[PDB]
Design an enzyme around this catalytic site. Structure first.
Site, PDB file in Angstrom:
ATOM      1  N   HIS B  54       0.788  -1.119  -0.232  1.00 55.00           N
ATOM      2  CA  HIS B  54       0.056  -0.249  -0.190  1.00 55.00           C
ATOM      3  C   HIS B  54       0.844   1.183   0.246  1.00 55.00           C
ATOM      4  O   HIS B  54       1.833   0.676   0.053  1.00 55.00           O
ATOM      5  CB  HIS B  54      -0.667   0.213   1.760  1.00 55.00           C
ATOM      6  CG  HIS B  54      -1.015  -0.048   2.777  1.00 55.00           C
ATOM      7  ND1 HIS B  54       0.172  -1.020   3.114  1.00 55.00           N
ATOM      8  CD2 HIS B  54      -1.021   0.873   3.646  1.00 55.00           C
ATOM      9  CE1 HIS B  54       0.329  -1.054   4.265  1.00 55.00           C
ATOM     10  NE2 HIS B  54      -0.274   0.715   4.850  1.00 55.00           N
ATOM     11  N   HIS B  56       0.536   3.760   1.964  1.00 55.83           N
ATOM     12  CA  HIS B  56       1.461   4.363   3.095  1.00 55.83           C
ATOM     13  C   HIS B  56       3.307   4.703   3.773  1.00 55.83           C
ATOM     14  O   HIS B  56       3.726   4.136   2.726  1.00 55.83           O
ATOM     15  CB  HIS B  56       1.215   3.774   4.906  1.00 55.83           C
ATOM     16  CG  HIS B  56      -0.503   4.215   4.522  1.00 55.83           C
ATOM     17  ND1 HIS B  56      -1.352   3.697   5.627  1.00 55.83           N
ATOM     18  CD2 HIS B  56      -1.529   4.919   4.035  1.00 55.83           C
ATOM     19  CE1 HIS B  56      -2.502   4.038   5.279  1.00 55.83           C
ATOM     20  NE2 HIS B  56      -2.641   4.554   4.582  1.00 55.83           N
ATOM     21  N   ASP B  58       5.793   3.992   5.527  1.00 54.26           N
ATOM     22  CA  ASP B  58       5.945   3.214   6.374  1.00 54.26           C
ATOM     23  C   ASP B  58       6.389   2.180   5.017  1.00 54.26           C
ATOM     24  O   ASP B  58       7.377   1.183   5.621  1.00 54.26           O
ATOM     25  CB  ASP B  58       5.918   3.048   7.739  1.00 54.26           C
ATOM     26  CG  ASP B  58       3.947   2.384   7.957  1.00 54.26           C
ATOM     27  OD1 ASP B  58       3.148   2.825   7.121  1.00 54.26           O
ATOM     28  OD2 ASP B  58       3.735   1.846   8.413  1.00 54.26           O
ATOM     29  N   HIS B  59       4.974   1.768   4.134  1.00 53.66           N
ATOM     30  CA  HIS B  59       5.528   1.057   3.232  1.00 53.66           C
ATOM     31  C   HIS B  59       6.461   0.978   1.950  1.00 53.66           C
ATOM     32  O   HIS B  59       7.202   0.896   1.631  1.00 53.66           O
ATOM     33  CB  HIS B  59       4.705   0.355   3.576  1.00 53.66           C
ATOM     34  CG  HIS B  59       3.664   0.037   4.589  1.00 53.66           C
ATOM     35  ND1 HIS B  59       3.566  -1.232   5.137  1.00 53.66           N
ATOM     36  CD2 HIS B  59       3.441   0.629   5.261  1.00 53.66           C
ATOM     37  CE1 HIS B  59       3.250  -1.580   6.121  1.00 53.66           C
ATOM     38  NE2 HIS B  59       3.125  -0.238   6.129  1.00 53.66           N
ATOM     39  N   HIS B 110      -7.752  -1.416   4.112  1.00 51.66           N
ATOM     40  CA  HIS B 110      -7.248  -0.280   5.239  1.00 51.66           C
ATOM     41  C   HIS B 110      -6.851   1.390   4.592  1.00 51.66           C
ATOM     42  O   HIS B 110      -6.804   2.176   5.361  1.00 51.66           O
ATOM     43  CB  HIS B 110      -5.911  -0.981   5.383  1.00 51.66           C
ATOM     44  CG  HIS B 110      -4.627   0.041   6.276  1.00 51.66           C
ATOM     45  ND1 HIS B 110      -4.522   0.363   8.060  1.00 51.66           N
ATOM     46  CD2 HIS B 110      -3.315  -0.060   5.344  1.00 51.66           C
ATOM     47  CE1 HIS B 110      -4.007   0.392   7.714  1.00 51.66           C
ATOM     48  NE2 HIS B 110      -2.662   1.027   6.784  1.00 51.66           N
ATOM     49  N   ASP B 134      -0.459  -3.851   5.698  1.00 49.54           N
ATOM     50  CA  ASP B 134      -1.756  -4.083   6.860  1.00 49.54           C
ATOM     51  C   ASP B 134      -3.314  -4.124   6.948  1.00 49.54           C
ATOM     52  O   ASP B 134      -4.078  -4.125   7.513  1.00 49.54           O
ATOM     53  CB  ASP B 134      -1.629  -2.125   6.891  1.00 49.54           C
ATOM     54  CG  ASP B 134      -0.090  -1.520   7.383  1.00 49.54           C
ATOM     55  OD1 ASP B 134       1.325  -2.948   7.632  1.00 49.54           O
ATOM     56  OD2 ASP B 134       0.397  -0.856   8.057  1.00 49.54           O
ATOM     57  N   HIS B 173       3.691  -5.216  10.236  1.00 46.78           N
ATOM     58  CA  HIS B 173       4.327  -4.534  11.633  1.00 46.78           C
ATOM     59  C   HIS B 173       4.402  -5.285  12.783  1.00 46.78           C
ATOM     60  O   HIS B 173       3.794  -7.106  12.619  1.00 46.78           O
ATOM     61  CB  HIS B 173       3.785  -3.667  12.224  1.00 46.78           C
ATOM     62  CG  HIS B 173       3.407  -2.495  11.129  1.00 46.78           C
ATOM     63  ND1 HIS B 173       4.417  -1.507  11.475  1.00 46.78           N
ATOM     64  CD2 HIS B 173       2.372  -1.523  10.237  1.00 46.78           C
ATOM     65  CE1 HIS B 173       3.579  -0.129  10.526  1.00 46.78           C
ATOM     66  NE2 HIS B 173       2.992  -0.558   9.844  1.00 46.78           N
TER      67      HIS B 173
END
Ligand SMILES: N[C@@H](CCC(=O)N[C@@H](CS[C@H](O)N(O)c1ccc(Br)cc1)C(=O)NCC(=O)O)C(=O)O
Ligand SMILES: N[C@@H](CCC(=O)N[C@@H](CS)C(=O)NCC(=O)O)C(=O)O
Ligand SMILES: [Zn+2]
Ligand SMILES: [Zn+2]
Ligand SMILES: [Zn+2]
Ligand SMILES: [Zn+2]
Lengths: 260, 260
Positions: B54, B56, B58-59, B110, B134, B173
């Site tokens: 995705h 976001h 952090d990805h 998400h 996620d 995570h």
């Protein structure tokens, strides 16, 4: 002092507060104004004052109309969002309704401009009354739309909670049965909850209001007034009144009401 | 196939997926691109492909930087907000990494463009793997930022839940301990939850990741995968999986995490 309970809408309450000495009267939260004028004519009283607990439409939405039906009214409230407001008041502001004394108590949480009205008779022997809007209900409290748990603790335990125990509580809505079903979940071993719930189901069956209650009674069965009680804290999994209040309000917001 | 778990940031996982035959490799969610290059060099493989779950940060926050360190990469994803895409894919899109087979699975909730990647080796001599970002965590699921309870039920129970039970789950995570503490509140009588919780605390102490889990294991202890179970429905006060999913996710959103 006489208080007449006037049902409005689906489950709201308006209150006609009469001074026996002068026959001057006040109206709390007049959302259906023709019912207000009909009740004042039934009792032969002169309406002089509007006491608005908060700005939500179900409480203040009839103010504009009432001031067109009746002339010379003084409209009190603690928030600029209130319709037809003439006298903006604050914490500890005072006014008279004939011989009755009214003291305004700021109780921000449900809305930031919420006011509770404490009405008494100076030198009299009758118990006082407090008009609590959507701050304190019989066995419950308002949703925290504009406020925090700390603010509801202050409103319930420090502002309203320090009034005389015999003060009669006249709240904004008829939510008593559902509030007591939630209270019974929080404290399964409390007999005062169970007996007040049987009493409320009988009053609903005959069409009579569940107001007023008294502050002393609220301290026996209202989970939000009882956030300092170890049973309530242990239920919430907390050890102080503020975190307990936050947890109990979040739980009630998601609670599914049983059918008995 | 060989999967190398690469910790990133505070609690994210990136995954180096190696085809042992051709020495080619893919990287899932390469947020710290230099760590990815060192790992590939350490394992003697050629990076060819980026699989993005995705958008976001952090990805996908390392994608544009990675394509400036290594040329000729094919960067896959299901959302135009992902940086440096070369190949926009959708539900059931297929591709190869060396001799490995990759199937894209759309799991919107998400984020609307979330994709999980199902990787398998021709034959059936090793269990397959699914990279779930996620959407599905070990014992939990992502917050519903761009979707509904019905979409999360479809993603978990039909799309991911119909894969082989031995499929290894490699999520975005390291949230396993906190996920299991919440799961224990939903089902205090479930033995798989308390056993997994105790195991996860030991893994955290020795510095080893809690991934991969298996789809079979998730059906025993994940409350979001268990929304069809009577125990989970009773906790939520609901009688169907969609309303149960909505209630459990709202509850987890404001859950106060205990210390043990
Ligand atoms: N119509 C609502 C009624 C239920 C409700 O939320 N009632 C309010 C007092 S009214 C009310 O607050 N209101 O009408 C309102 C009006 C205008 C605005 Br803006 C916001 C709110 C409350 O505080 N209940 C106590 C409890 O749930 O324990 C419902 O969707 O069920
Ligand atoms: N309050 C959380 C916020 C973290 C958060 O939002 N994480 C995202 C993934 S980047 C999520 O979907 N978490 C799943 C959950 O809260 O169950 C924490 O720090 O644990
Ligand atoms: Zn209100
Ligand atoms: Zn109201
Ligand atoms: Zn995310
Ligand atoms: Zn993430």
């Amino acid at each position: 002092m006489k208080v007449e309970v006037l049902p409005a809408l689906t489950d709201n309450y308006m209150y006609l507060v009469i001074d026996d000495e002068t026959k001057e009267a006040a109206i709390v939260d007049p959302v259906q104004p023709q019912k207000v004028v009909d009740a004042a004519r039934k009792h032969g009283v002169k309406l002089t004052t509007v006491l608005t607990t908060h700005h939500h439409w179900d409480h203040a939405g009839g103010n504009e109309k009432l001031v067109k039906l009746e002339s010379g009214l003084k409209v009190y409230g603690g928030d600029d969002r209130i319709g037809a407001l003439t006298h903006k008041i604050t914490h500890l502001s005072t006014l008279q309704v004939g011989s009755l004394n009214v003291k305004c108590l700021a109780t921000p949480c449900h809305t930031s401009g919420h006011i509770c009205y404490f009405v008494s008779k100076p030198g009299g022997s009758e118990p006082p009354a407090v008009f609590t809007g959507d701050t304190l209900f019989v066995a419950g409290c308002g949703k925290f739309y504009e406020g925090t748990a700390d603010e509801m603790c202050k409103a319930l335990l420090e502002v309203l909670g320090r009034l005389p125990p015999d003060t009669r509580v006249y709240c904004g809505h008829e939510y008593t049965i559902n509030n007591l079903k939630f209270a019974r979940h929080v404290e399964p071993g409390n007999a005062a909850i169970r007996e007040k719930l049987a009493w409320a189901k009988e009053k609903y069956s005959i069409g009579e209001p569940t107001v007023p209650s008294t502050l002393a009674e609220e301290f026996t069965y209202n989970p939000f007034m009882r956030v300092r009680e170890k049973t309530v804290q242990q239920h919430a999994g907390e050890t102080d009144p503020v975190t307990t209040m936050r947890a109990v309000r979040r739980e009630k917001d998601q609670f599914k009401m049983p059918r008995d």
